[PDB]
Design a protein around this nucleic acid. Structure first.
Ligand SMILES: [Mg+2]
Ligand SMILES: [Zn+2]
Ligand SMILES: [Zn+2]
Ligand SMILES: [Zn+2]
Ligand SMILES: [Zn+2]
Lengths: 640, 1221
RNA sequence: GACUUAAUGUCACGGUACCCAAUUUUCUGCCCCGGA
RNA sequence: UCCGGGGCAGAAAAUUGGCAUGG
């Protein structure tokens, strides 16, 4: 009939889409066209179609599902939609009926994918029952159908006995190394051959794009191994993390938001593996922990570091950040007397790490802490701040005290020696914490800054003449003769900041600021006319290379309290760091004018920020919480 | 102790099916609706159930109100210092509560003397039930120090009676399109808005606080609330079946869709249209007089209404129209079903405690802005089909109305709280210039500015006090290639009237009234100079939903001081219309007017973000041509029997609180928007491409795609010249005339009712479009270019625009001397002794060239020149164009009853002829000249016998049916049903010359009485079935009008008054001027068009009534020709165009036009000897009136085969100017 | 009473049925021979 | 053996179809 020829054309289209020869961008379009043909046929025949036509509709829906790559955190709703619709249509095909075997094959693969993405809707026992139905209905043909291999591997992973099809599973040419390893591990328990096949898959991972479902499948395999208390999960996690590193080195900066940020649990798993493996060998393990921690920090920002083309790309990055549609130095290189505290908040476990390197002692050591209570207190501080800026100071102090309570090691002499300058490399919400102002949990406790002149760095990759000052006040010391020719005091002339040259040794942007928690790329320095923002800073201003920027603007270093898909800072101060600024004294929240001007008094570029903060009200946490809040807001960012 | 609590809702509260707590996780719809009103089925079948409100939900609302109340009063109530309470159940201590808080908890400095325990606790802990016997698992009802029982609905109970299922939305701010959607059951808040429950309290110390909390619960179940303390369808379907079957019997099945549309629109007319028989009577009627089961359709509908009077007239009309539509769909190959393949995203959504501590002594207050949203434009609030809108219920059957406007349970228009809230959130995000795209199910609150405001803002679902049925806009999509309606592109949208005012409530609860919220409220206000800018609802791009928020009256509850009176008055929740309509003195105790509303220009976010957001460009189109935006569906319902009428809007007038008595004629905002979009996509070529995915064309950024909103929003082109015209709608008759038979085809006669636009009295249509902030200079210049293109008359507005309708006169923000030899017989017979036939035939040939490379309408191709010709009509003999709007225009029927007397065609008192007649004459001349098909042909008409008329005609000569086989040059240039014409003839306007022909014979001067005008008989032209069809019928240029003048009295006396007609007649030498626009026109095509206009110095055209009588022959003079890619083309290039058109004609055959014999025959048919040949029709016999003695020129002599052979007669009818005697 | 609540934790007012579409395309108010 | 006569007065098409989330 007409239905037969229509569905034959749709099946030809789906098969032409199935093979990897076709480009994915047109593969999606031709799968959608085949689905359009099939759905038009289904609508024109309403509820009485040939069973194989319903099976073809379900296969088209599954093929749509297989081409919907998951986003950074949330599974795309079209993926769940197509899986649900395919399952429903193949259920209609099963109720009224080597064709039943392929119907149950498509049903089982659809249900496998639905269980993988939405385990609650397709629970594991129901999936197991339907997988058994499929395998007793002939779903065993390997070396010709990769799907049968998928049912076989899922069945062996649910825990049923699958030793009979092992030989056919392995001899099949269309089985990837991960399915081979799962078969060798789950039914034959051949840990050596499972290790060999997993090593092969991990080596192949160095080239597969992060969008590939093989990444999620191998993360799930190693997760299952870790839950099984297997002895191979550590090496598998470490090697897969090395593969993720080399791959992320070559993915697009847009796909860092989308698909690389998916493999954060993989970095957590590798961190756990190295931590379990952790005298000299132990120190190398500690340094590898630091490397794993730093590899997750500010990767898309690191790629943010002619003009119109870069502006267009930055606009694309901003649209991708908002979940919109886009239209198309070693860690031991610290200078002497400086201690670097690398942080890492493991999300797979409930712990966070504080890998520290002491350069003078050349000593690596980490301490674990519970960041859940500290995170709740930090969110308390952020909510109270966004409601009441200067009246949340008390909470800030509490938060600071929490940093001294959840992290008492910050005040241990053996951890961070007293008097050693500290460079924090925080992770996740610790990026937004005043680690410089942390108060030790002792009677009359001292802040962290008092003992150590502590500066920050969003990631270790950020670490890397003119001798005049170019203050750009837009709010006395504006008439001081130390200000250079390019310095402006009446109108900020944001265009002049775009046109600042000669790599000044210092410049003060005395203006206002807005954090823009909704979109950190429009975090604005309220300069003249249109305020310059993170988007404009990354493109327009180019003079401040090697500069020592001082930011009197409010909320220069304020970020949305909630962590992004990946750990990056997205602040105005980080924006200026991205254009070559050697150091930034950006402000972490709203401040008064008196403290900013006092900062500018400290000419006197070589003077440490810590001496300031000690002198002017920093120690007065019990005396006056508001003066503490005004004091610590100026974190120091950069590397000497 | 224990008290009965009544929870009254004041806007439609959300409802969801009750699920058990463990089973609730299975369904995400009930998982989300944990704060909704619960509904549990009372029996099998999923038909009837009971609606309740979970006592835990009322308890959560009450403890939230206690949190806010204590936070306002520095952590105290009535002098009793409470503690911060506990909202953290440790998992080791016990099981977590079923509902986990994901919001900031209002906290304060603890002033309690001792820690709270079982022995004694603060009223906050008592209201929490912190230290009672009852715990997280219910065992007994006596274990609760505070107990909130279930709240059963106070009024078995069917679900559809209480609730209506509705799809909500999550519209992306950047793209303007909804990311996803979800469905909830908005229950009736009028008949089922009251819920009774019980609250027991054995700890009287907290009692006062509890009662205060009951007064502080602003909203519950998704609705504002006060918490006080004590089947014709089957029969209609059968009748639809019988009606549709009877229509199918008369092969009028396709008319059933039109009938369903008319029946649905009858709901706007009320009962009287059927009971008083206000439907058009007919000249019977083509649709309302169709015989159904033995009776007329109108009488059948009257009987149906009498039988179905039980349901209201509105409901009866909608149900009958829907049933007729559904049955028609069933009989045409099944009813269309909708199925979103991939994107039907029905989406539904880290335990953490965040204590927020407001500073001690801070002042928090409530500003309740009350006003009226006036629909400055026809508003549309979308809703799904009624089948989808049934609670408790996979293809979905597409109902009659493609787009329904959301309505209240009593058919009143509704502005949802959700839609108005989303529009307010978008405007707030604009005002701040910084806001999030709403994240669903987030672990913590969005602390971005817009989210904080929205969490502090509570609106009210508003229902208009106007329940009359919606108006219907029948939007279509034009095919860019053929400029015709796209296949399958047709949809009726229910829009509410403009000017309809809804209540508007906006409660802000917070410390300081924001500059951005005040900026938004000033943005929405119309005030005096600006326009209201609340773009609520949908269809914003087509000017639907621009609401002016007028009658704004902000108030203020000083919550820190006036909390007791606020609780007493319940925040005036459900009493906001009182705040609108009560005096300043009669306010409640704690409510004071807010005198600190910042003015419009004193709000920086308004001036910087909101004011430049939408720039209004208002302009007035002056149209010197009749304007007709067709409303055929509405044309059928209201009387006059007009086939097509000008579109008119139903406009609400709150001054009289009713629809305006005279509807406002306008070019719909959809038509205006489509004209602009076509202009932009033609200048930029953006209309050319078929796919606009991942696409950034200028038209795509300006006008939006399937995935992005529009940066330009078009409003209606309202006619502001209604009072200027005495007869605003001019009845213009039209009829297709067979190319072979000079008669008026069969069924091709029709009429039109366009607005009386004339060059001297043009129509002024004032319309405006809004431009989004951030338009490129290139895009702004492109919009200006499109506006100027409209100004130059490139795109007429409305139907029949290519025939002389809706031509834009403006906006406000050369000769030929070709000599033709003629024919030997008239020139040689200088004595005028010869008598000729009044019409002859052109047998051009069997071969017709069809161009399958159809010229597109999607761009102005550079190789093809577009422009405008100005042509001078010169009448070398009296011309007759009757003003057939009034068949008694001359008012002489008193002397001669039954006589058809018409004035000359004229609009608004100035003398003109329709551009449709000019196009028809030029098209006949062009088809004959280019050997094109008989585009209009009476095939269905039968001839007296072996076969029909269509069989005799050649296959190649047949009218072009579809673009698949291509179109002939006549149908290529002038268009067909599938293809819009690329030539557009305007209404010729009289300029100078003798105004009228004056004949002393007629008692009414300047008028002339014609003879008998009877239908031509193909039997004379085709004497036998074997003989072929002669060809295209043409008439000669002769002075038979002089004969009519000398026999005026004889014609009047001998001919019956009803047999003939009298007309106002032109004189010799009258001059008209008409414009002829063309787009994407070939050089040879333009040359051929110019030649067909002005063929030569002696060749003239024939146009008007009385062509066989020698009337209505005109000379066209091209005095100017402008082209643009606007430069005036010199006569040299014009002659070059005509020469290459001659070359194309020669290539077709395989500048002296007589060389090719068929063109010579055509032009000698149009040759003007004036010489004075005598031409008149033969008489029947030797005894008939008007006979000349001693002449063989009679039809008896020319009818018999023996005396006049059939073949010789056929040859003579094919030979122009042939001597008949 | 149950239907139908769990209680030291419900931002669903946490979510514009939104986005795209020209009621349009073709047509001269025109015209002569037969009927029993 | 006969001396009149109107015609169409809308026909056909569409009546919904799509809605980019990874180069
Ligand atoms: Mg209790
Ligand atoms: Zn208490
Ligand atoms: Zn938000
Ligand atoms: Zn485009
Ligand atoms: Zn044709």
């Amino acid at each position: 009939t007409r239905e037969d020829i229509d569905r034959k054309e749709a099946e030809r289209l789906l098969d032409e889409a199935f093979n990897p020869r076709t480009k994915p961008v047109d593969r999606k379009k031709i799968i959608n066209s085949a689905l359009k043909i099939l759905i038009g046929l289904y609508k024109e025949k309403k509820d009485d179609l040939t069973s194989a036509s319903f099976i073809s509709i379900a296969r088209a829906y599954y093929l749509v599902s297989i081409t919907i790559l998951p986003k950074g955190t949330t599974i795309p709703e079209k993926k769940k939609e197509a899986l649900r619709k395919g399952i429903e249509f193949i259920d209609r095909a099963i109720n009224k009926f080597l064709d039943s075997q392929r119907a149950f094959r498509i049903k089982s693969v659809l249900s496998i994918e639905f269980n993988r993405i939405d385990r609650e809707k397709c629970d594991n026992i129901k999936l197991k029952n339907l997988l058994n139905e499929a395998v007793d209905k002939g779903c065993t043909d390997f070396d010709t159908y990769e799907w049968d291999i998928q049912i076989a591997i899922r069945l062996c992973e649910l825990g049923v006995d699958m030793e009979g099809h092992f030989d056919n599973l392995i001899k099949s040419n269309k089985a990837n190394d991960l399915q081979k390893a799962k078969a060798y591990y789950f039914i034959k328990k051949d840990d050596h051959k499972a290790k060999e096949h997993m090593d092969k898959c991990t080596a192949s991972l160095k080239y597969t794009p992060c969008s590939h479902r093989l990444w999620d499948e191998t993360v799930g395999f190693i997760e299952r191994l870790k839950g099984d208390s297997s002895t191979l999960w550590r090496d598998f996690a470490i090697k897969t993390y090395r593969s993720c590193r080399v791959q992320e080195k070559e993915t697009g900066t847009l796909r860092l938001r989308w698909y690389w940020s998916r493999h954060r649990v993989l970095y957590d798993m590798a961190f756990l593996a190295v931590k379990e493996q952790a005298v000299n060998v132990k120190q190398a393990k500690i340094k590898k922990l630091a490397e794993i921690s730093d590899s997750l920090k500010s990767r898309f920002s690191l790629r943010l570091s002619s003009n119109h083309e870069f502006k267009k790309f930055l606009d694309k990055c901003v649209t991708a950040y908002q979940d919109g549609y886009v239209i198309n130095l070693e860690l031991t290189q610290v200078p002497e007397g400086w201690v670097v505290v690398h942080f890492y908040l493991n999300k797979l476990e409930g712990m966070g790490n504080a890998i520290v390197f002491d350069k003078c002692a050349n000593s690596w050591q980490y301490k674990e802490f519970q960041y859940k209570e500290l995170f709740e207190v930090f969110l308390t501080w952020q909510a109270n701040y966004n409601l009441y800026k200067e009246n949340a100071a008390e909470h800030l102090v509490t938060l600071c005290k929490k940093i001294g309570e959840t992290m008492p090691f910050l005040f241990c002499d053996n951890f961070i020696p007293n008097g050693k300058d500290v460079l924090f490399v925080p992770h996740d919400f610790l990026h937004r914490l005043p680690l410089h102002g942390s108060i030790e949990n002792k009677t009359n406790g001292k802040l962290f800054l008092e003992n150590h002149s502590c500066c920050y760095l969003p990631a270790w990759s950020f670490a890397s003449t003119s001798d005049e000052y170019v203050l750009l006040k837009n709010f006395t010391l504006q008439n001081n003769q130390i200000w250079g020719t390019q310095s402006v005091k009446d109108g900020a002339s944001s265009d002049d900041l775009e046109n600042i040259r000669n790599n000044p040794r210092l410049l003060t942007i005395l203006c206002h600021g807005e954090a823009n928690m909704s979109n950190p790329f429009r975090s604005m320095l309220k300069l003249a006319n249109g305020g310059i923002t993170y988007l404009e800073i990354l493109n327009s201003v180019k003079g401040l290379k090697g500069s020592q920027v001082i930011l009197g603007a409010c909320e220069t270093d304020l970020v949305p309290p909630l962590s992004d898909v990946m750990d990056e800072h997205y602040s105005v101060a980080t924006a200026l760091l991205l254009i070559g600024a050697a150091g930034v004294v950006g402000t972490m929240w709203k401040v008064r004018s008196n403290k900013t001007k006092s900062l500018i008094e400290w000419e006197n570029i070589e003077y440490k920020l810590n001496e300031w903060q000690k002198e002017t009200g920093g120690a007065a946490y019990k005396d006056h919480p508001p003066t503490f809040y005004r004091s610590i807001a100026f974190r120091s960012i950069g590397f000497p | 102790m224990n008290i009965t609590v009544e929870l009254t809702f004041f806007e439609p509260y959300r409802l969801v099916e009750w699920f058990d707590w463990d089973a609730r996780k299975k369904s995400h719809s009930a998982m989300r609706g944990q704060a909704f009103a619960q509904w549990t089925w009372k029996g099998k079948g999923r038909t009837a159930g009971k609606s309740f409100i979970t006592g835990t939900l009322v308890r959560s609302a009450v403890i939230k109100a206690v949190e806010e109340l204590l936070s306002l009063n520095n952590g105290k109530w009535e002098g009793v210092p409470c503690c911060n309470g506990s909202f953290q159940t440790d998992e080791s201590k016990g099981k977590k509560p079923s509902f986990l808080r994901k919001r900031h908890t209002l906290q304060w400095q603890a002033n309690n003397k001792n820690i709270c325990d079982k022995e004694e606790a603060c009223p906050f802990c008592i209201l929490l039930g912190r230290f009672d016997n009852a715990g997280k698992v219910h065992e007994r009802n006596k274990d609760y120090d505070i107990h909130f029982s279930n709240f059963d609905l106070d009024h078995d109970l069917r679900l559809v009676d209480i609730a209506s299922g509705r799809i909500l939305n999550r519209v992306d701010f950047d793209t303007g399109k909804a990311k996803d959607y979800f469905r909830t059951w908005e229950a009736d808040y009028e008949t089922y808005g009251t819920y009774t429950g019980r609250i027991t309290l054995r700890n009287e110390h907290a009692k006062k606080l509890l009662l205060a909390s009951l007064g502080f619960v602003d909203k519950l179940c998704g609705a504002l609330c006060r918490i006080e303390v004590i089947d014709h369808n089957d029969e209609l379907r059968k009748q639809a079946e019988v009606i549709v079957e009877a229509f199918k019997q008369n092969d009028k099945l396709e008319k059933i869709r039109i009938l369903a549309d008319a029946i649905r629109t009858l709901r706007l007319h009320g009962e009287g249209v059927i009971e008083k028989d206000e439907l058009p009577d007919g000249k019977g009627h083509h649709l309302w007089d169709i015989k159904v089961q033995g009776t007329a359709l109108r009488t059948k509908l009257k009987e149906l209404w009498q039988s179905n009077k039980d349901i209201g007239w509105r409901k009866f009309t909608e149900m009958l129209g829907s049933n007729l539509y559904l049955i028609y769909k069933k009989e045409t190959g099944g009813v269309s079903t909708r199925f979103r393949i991939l994107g039907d995203t029905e989406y539904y959504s880290s335990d953490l405690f965040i204590p927020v501590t407001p500073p001690e002594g801070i002042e928090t207050k409530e500003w309740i802005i009350v006003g009226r949203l006036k629909a400055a434009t026809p508003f549309y609030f979308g809703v799904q089909q009624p089948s989808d809108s049934i609670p408790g219920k996979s293809l979905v059957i597409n109902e009659h109305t493609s787009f329904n406007i959301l309505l209240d349970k009593e058919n009143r228009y509704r502005i949802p709280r959700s839609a108005l809230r989303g529009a307010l959130r978008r405007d707030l995000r604009t005002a701040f210039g910084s806001g999030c795209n709403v994240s669903l199910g987030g672990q913590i609150l969005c602390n971005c500015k817009v989210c904080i405001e929205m969490r502090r803002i509570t609106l009210k679902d508003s229902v208009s006090d106007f329940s009359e049925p919606p108006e219907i806009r029948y939007r279509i999509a034009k095919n860019p290639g053929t400029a015709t309606v796209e296949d399958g592109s047709l949809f009726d949208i229910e829009v509410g009237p403009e000017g309809l005012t809804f209540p508007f409530v906006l409660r802000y609860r917070g410390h300081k009234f924001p500059e951005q919220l005040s900026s938004v409220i000033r943005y929405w206000e119309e005030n005096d100079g600006k326009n209201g800018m609340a773009w609520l609802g949908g269809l914003d791009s087509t000017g639907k939903g621009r609401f002016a928020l007028k009658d704004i009256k902000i108030f203020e509850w000083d919550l820190n001081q006036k909390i007791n009176e606020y609780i007493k008055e319940r925040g005036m929740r459900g009493k906001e219309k009182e705040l609108l309509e009560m005096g300043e003195s009669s306010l409640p105790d704690g409510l004071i007017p807010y005198k600190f509303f910042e003015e419009r220009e004193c709000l920086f976010p308004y001036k910087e973000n909101l004011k430049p957001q939408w720039s209004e460009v208002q302009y007035t189109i002056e149209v010197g041509s009749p304007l007709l935006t067709a409303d055929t569906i509405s044309a059928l319902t209201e009387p006059g029997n007009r086939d097509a009428i000008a579109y008119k809007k139903r406009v609400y007038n709150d001054g009289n609180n009713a629809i305006e008595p005279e509807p406002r004629f306008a070019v719909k905002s959809e038509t205006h928007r489509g004209i602009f979009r076509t202009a932009v996509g033609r200048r930029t070529g953006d209309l050319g491409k078929e796919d606009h995915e991942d696409c950034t064309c200028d038209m795509c950024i300006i006008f939006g795609n399937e995935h992005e909103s529009s940066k330009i929003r078009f409003e209606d082109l309202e006619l502001i010249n209604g009072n200027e015209f005495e007869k605003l709608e001019k009845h213009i008759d039209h009829v297709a005339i067979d190319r072979f038979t000079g008669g008026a085809l069969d069924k091709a006669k029709f009429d039109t009712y366009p607005l009386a636009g004339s060059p001297k009295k043009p129509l002024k249509l004032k319309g405006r479009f809004w431009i989004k902030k951030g338009f490129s200079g290139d895009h702004k210049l492109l919009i200006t270019t499109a506006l100027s293109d409209i100004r130059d008359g490139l795109y007429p507005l409305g139907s029949k625009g290519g025939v002389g309708y809706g031509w834009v006169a403006g906006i406000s923000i050369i000769n030929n001397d070709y000599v033709h030899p003629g024919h030997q017989s008239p020139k040689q017979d200088h004595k005028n002794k010869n008598i000729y036939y009044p019409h002859y035939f052109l047998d051009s040939g069997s071969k017709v060239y069809r161009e399958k490379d159809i010229i597109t309408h999607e761009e102005f191709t550079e190789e093809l020149l577009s422009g405008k010709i100005n042509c001078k009509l010169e009448t070398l003999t009296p011309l007759i164009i009757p003003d057939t709007s009034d068949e008694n225009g001359l008012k002489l029927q008193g002397n001669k009853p039954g006589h058809k007397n018409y004035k000359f065609f004229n609009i608004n008192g100035e003398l003109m002829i329709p551009g449709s007649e000019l196009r028809g004459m030029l098209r006949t001349h062009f088809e004959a000249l280019t050997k094109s098909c008989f585009a209009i042909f009476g095939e269905d008409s039968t001839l007296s016998a072996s076969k029909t008329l269509g069989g005799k005609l050649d296959k190649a000569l047949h009218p072009c049916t579809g673009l698949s086989d291509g179109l002939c040059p006549g149908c290529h240039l002038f268009g067909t049903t599938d293809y819009k014409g690329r030539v557009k003839f305007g209404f010729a306007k009289y300029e100078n010359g003798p105004e009228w022909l004056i004949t002393r014979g007629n008692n009414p001067e300047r008028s002339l009485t014609l003879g008998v005008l009877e239908s031509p008989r193909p039997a004379f032209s085709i004497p036998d079935d074997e003989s072929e069809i002669p060809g295209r019928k043409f008439y000669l240029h002769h002075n038979g009008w002089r004969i009519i003048r000398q026999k005026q009295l004889e014609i009047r006396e001998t001919v019956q008054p009803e047999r003939n007609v009298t007309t106002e007649v032109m004189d010799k030498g009258n001059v008209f001027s008409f414009d002829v626009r063309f787009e994407n026109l070939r050089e040879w095509e333009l040359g051929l068009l110019l030649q067909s206009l002005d063929p030569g110095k002696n060749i003239a055209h024939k146009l008007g009534k009385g062509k066989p009588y020698g009337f209505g022959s005109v000379k066209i003079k091209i005095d100017s020709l402008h082209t643009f890619k606007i430069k005036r083309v010199p006569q040299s290039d014009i002659r070059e165009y005509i020469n290459k058109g001659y070359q194309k004609l020669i290539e077709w055959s395989g500048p002296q036009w007589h060389v090719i014999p068929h063109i010579d025959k055509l032009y000698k048919l149009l040759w003007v000897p004036f010489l004075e040949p005598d031409v008149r029709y033969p008489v029947l016999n030797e005894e008939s009136k008007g006979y000349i003695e001693g002449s063989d020129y009679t039809y008896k002599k020319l009818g018999d085969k023996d005396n006049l052979p059939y073949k010789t007669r056929v040859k003579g009818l094919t030979t122009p100017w042939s001597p008949w005697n």
